[PDB]
């Protein structure tokens with residue numbers, strides 16, 4: 352039970368306005384032939400241009416929405432739109448580039464996919480709402496064959512050159528003219544009623560139709576994200592390390608310990624209500640406090656309603672560590688992912704949400720400032736009651752209102768605490784650069800922390 356059988360049936364009803372007369376009975380085998388490719392009985396790791404939902408989910412980082420619209424084949428120019436926001440016009444004689452021939456269009460398609468995907472994926476998965484012109488356009492800029500490696504490295508080839516008759520990965524594809532062994536998935540085979548627009552708009556108010564190919568391409572990918580990551584969720588599935596995953600996660604664990612430990616020391620809450628990930632550990636195992644856990648899986652669609660999560664949390668402090676609710680109570684410590692962040696780890700999502708893909712994939716509900724009215728931003732600080740002592744660590748003295756140690760209260764930061772500061776400030780910047788935001792009860796006062804040494 353691995354790949355999508357080329358002998359699987361393909362519903363053709365969606366194709367038949369662009370391709371009048373097309374058989375009702377069709378398989379991927381026959382369709383690929385119709386699109387102008389020859390498969391060639393080959394068991395060389397490309398058993399179908401089209402892939403399963405489950406294969407597509409495993410490769411969400413490679414999704415590029417793709418759509419073609421006929422401005423007038425041979426007898427007209429095509430507008431190629433992608434979920435990058437790009438719109439190319441090929442003639443056969445927001446970005447909306449005027450009409451150019453296919454030899455320049457195909458060089459642009461490769462540069463664009465290469466730049467979008469080189470730090471994301473070893474492939475591209477073109478995500479379609481297929482009506483016909485997109486599948487018949489592919490012969491103009493795609494080549495298939497055996498799986499191959501890059502001539503310049505050990506990565507799988509994603510592009511081909513007719514000039515040099517060679518193959519390249521997304522990093523090494525510079526000047527190449529053909530997308531080589533792309534994947535595709537037609538969303539219309541998933542069993543939908545009505546047009547793209549009608550199905551997209553059930554779920555998302557953020558993308559409109561400006562009757563242009565890239566809008567359709569963005570809506571297609573969005574709907575696919577909704578069906579695969581909002582309505583269905585599979586946290587089992589692991590995804591490869593492509594970036595600062597490991598640093599971000601350790602950083603997140605250190606800020607959590609720091610912030611919660613400081614909060615218990617300053618304000619001495621007698622009980623902490625820990626609300627989220629049902630696997631969560633005590634982030635401050637030594638803290639003198641009644642730790643009570645409450646189970647809530649990551650909400651992928653709408654932020655939890657606080658009225659439904661609590662049905663005496665007004666006692667002590669509530670810890671929502673990436674537990675997204677509509678309105679945090681005033682007595683909260685909070686870490687919320689800011690869906691608006693631009694990164695390799697954070698893919699555009701559904702209805703202003705974002706798909707954050709770090710070991711596991713988490714569609715996150717759109718960031719809302721109004722959730723935080725009862726709180727304030729957590730102020731930066733580093734705190735340590737650890738003993739000053741180097742043991743074992745550079746030194747160019749550090750100069751800070753925010754280094755809260757016995758040594759700096761004194762006026763002479765020790766070497767161990769000056770390193771730990773610099774480290775902590777790195778982890779902190781790291782976590783914020785990654786898109787997380789920290790929020791605390793309004794009564795939280797850094798000045799209180801100086802009196803936790805006497």
Ligand SMILES: NS(=O)(=O)c1ccccc1OC(F)F
Pocket residue numbers: 645659660661662
């Ligand atoms: N968060 S809470 O403790 O108010 C809660 C939430 C959902 C179900 C039960 C429940 O507690 C009650 F069962 F004891």
Ligand SMILES: NS(=O)(=O)c1ccccc1OC(F)F
Pocket residue numbers: 618667668681682683792793794795
């Ligand atoms: N911190 S808090 O948000 O739990 C809170 C709220 C109202 C009154 C006191 C109070 O405690 C304060 F001392 F911290």
Ligand SMILES: NS(=O)(=O)c1ccccc1OC(F)F
Pocket residue numbers: 731732733752753754755796797798800
């Ligand atoms: N509240 S305070 O006066 O101690 C202070 C002043 C400027 C910057 C940070 C800061 O807090 C510090 F504890 F981290």
Ligand SMILES: [Zn+2]
Pocket residue numbers: 501502503504505506519520521522523
């Ligand atoms: Zn390469």
Ligand SMILES: [Zn+2]
Pocket residue numbers: 551555556557558569570573574700701702
């Ligand atoms: Zn959308």
Ligand SMILES: [Zn+2]
Pocket residue numbers: 738739740756757758759764765766767768
């Ligand atoms: Zn010290």
